[PDB]
């Protein structure tokens, strides 16, 4: 099965998922001098005050914090989007070293990790329908750099011991994702894809310009997770990022100049 190892990593994925070589794959390198300022772009509207987190899960390639998406509780609108997108989960990608880990890069610069808040377009009724549409998903991407600790992240860090191996889950209620946002909501946006299989080209990417800082101790605890299931040989969950893909016939737009 697919993963991030030498024998099943991103350069192998196209054999099972031919769309890996598609025309609107993610992630990409954001060239800040080629991105076009678009004054017609609206500010992002993040409404997370009623968010209901349920569970945190190690799924074998990352850990997901899952939300109740049966109503318009935590939604994303505005920006480049038409209509209302519901938050369903967030997860991270990170590296084995502080100098790598993000999926998107900015002028070829890598960050230590990247947070993805995944939302789906409510006009399609459920998430599985949404991923089959060109405007089905909106993923908010936030860069993590190593520096001062992020207080709002610590509740996530402290529960990781309980979901060390693949398939483990833990109740995770009353988590407020607003504690993970940067001060500014300026962004780049482009049409792209899921960055893990099935790599569907259904995503409007919204990548925030301002990174958040987390401490070395916080990111260190990410790196203690396991790709494997309990009772299997230990493989540390690190470097679960896909490298940048060709931009091809797309333009990256910026909400700011
Ligand atoms: C369709 C089964 O659920 C999936 C599969 C892949 C996938 N990739 C992302 S990401 N890394 O935010 O682009 S969210 C997501 C959800
Ligand atoms: Zn992701």
How is the chain split into domains, by residue range? Answer: 1-257
Q: What is the dihedral of CA 187, 153, 169, 100, to 10 degrees?
A: 60
Pocket flag, ligand 1, residue 102 (CB < 6 Å): no
Atom 6 of ligand 1: nearest residue by CA position: 196
- Give the three-state DSSP class for 74: coil
Distance between CA 181 and CA 183 in Å, rounded?
7
C-alpha 18 chain-centroid distance:
22
Nominal resolution (angstroms): 1.8
Ligand 1, pocket-test mutation among 196, 200, 204, 240, most atoms within 8 A of CB: 196
* Alpha helices (runs of H) in the chain, residue ranges in sequence order: 127-130, 154-159, 216-222
| Pairing, β 253-254 against β 105-106 | unpaired
Q: Which residue from 154, 152, 141 is spatially nearest to 222, judged by alpha carbons?
A: 154
Atom 9 of ligand 1: nearest residue by CA position: 194
Distance between CA 24 and CA 99 in Å, rounded?
26
* 18, 20, 41, 91, 248 from 64: Cα distances, Å: 26, 23, 30, 5, 30
**Closest atom, ligand 1, to C-alpha of 26:** 13
Q: Which residue from 245, 124, 240 is spatially nearest to 191, judged by alpha carbons?
A: 245
Pocket flag, ligand 1, residue 117 (CB < 6 Å): no
Q: At which residue do the structure tokens 């936030």 appear?
A: 142
Helices (H) and strands (E) in the chain, counts: 3, 15
**Catalytic choice (1, 61, 104, 119):** 61
What are φ and ψ of residue 121, in 5° steps?
-70, 120
Let me know: does 195 contact 26? Beta carbons within 8 Å. Answer: yes
Q: Which residues, at least 6 apart from 6, have a Cβ–Cβ distance to it below 8 Å?
A: none
| 61 catalytically annotated | yes
Let me know: does 212 contact 143? Beta carbons within 8 Å. Answer: yes
Residue 122 annotated as part of some ligand binding site: no
**Could you name the CATH architecture of 1-257?**
Roll (3.10)
Q: How many angstroms is it from 158 CA to the middle of ligand 1?
A: 24
How many residues would you count in the chain?
257
Which residues is 4 bridged to in the sheet?
A: none
């Amino acid at each position: 099965h697919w993963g991030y190892g030498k024998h099943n990593g991103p350069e192998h994925w196209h054999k099972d998922f031919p769309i890996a070589k598609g025309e609107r794959q993610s992630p990409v390198d954001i060239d800040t001098h080629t991105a076009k300022y678009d004054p017609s772009l609206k500010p992002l509207s993040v409404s997370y005050d009623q968010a209901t987190s349920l569970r945190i899960l190690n799924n074998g390639h990352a850990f997901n914090v899952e939300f109740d998406d049966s109503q318009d509780k935590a939604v994303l609108k505005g920006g480049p989007l038409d209509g209302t997108y519901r938050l369903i989960q967030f997860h991270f990608h990170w590296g084995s070293l502080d100098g790598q880990g993000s999926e998107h890069t900015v002028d070829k610069k890598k960050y230590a990790a990247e947070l993805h808040l995944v939302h789906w377009n409510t006009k399609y009724g459920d998430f599985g329908k949404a991923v089959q549409q060109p405007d089905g998903l909106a993923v908010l991407g936030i860069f993590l750099k190593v520096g001062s600790a992020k207080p709002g992240l610590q509740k996530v860090v402290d529960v990781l011991d309980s979901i060390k191996t693949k398939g483990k889950s833990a109740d995770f209620t009353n988590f407020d994702p607003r504690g993970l946002l940067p001060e500014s909501l300026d962004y780049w946006t482009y049409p792209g894809s899921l960055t893990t299989p099935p790599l569907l080209e259904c995503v409007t990417w919204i990548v925030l310009k301002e990174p958040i800082s987390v401490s070395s101790e916080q990111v260190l605890k990410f790196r203690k997770l396991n790709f494997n299931g309990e009772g299997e040989p230990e493989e540390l969950m690190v470097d679960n990022w896909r490298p940048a893909q060709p931009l091809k016939n797309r333009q990256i737009k910026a909400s700011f100049k």
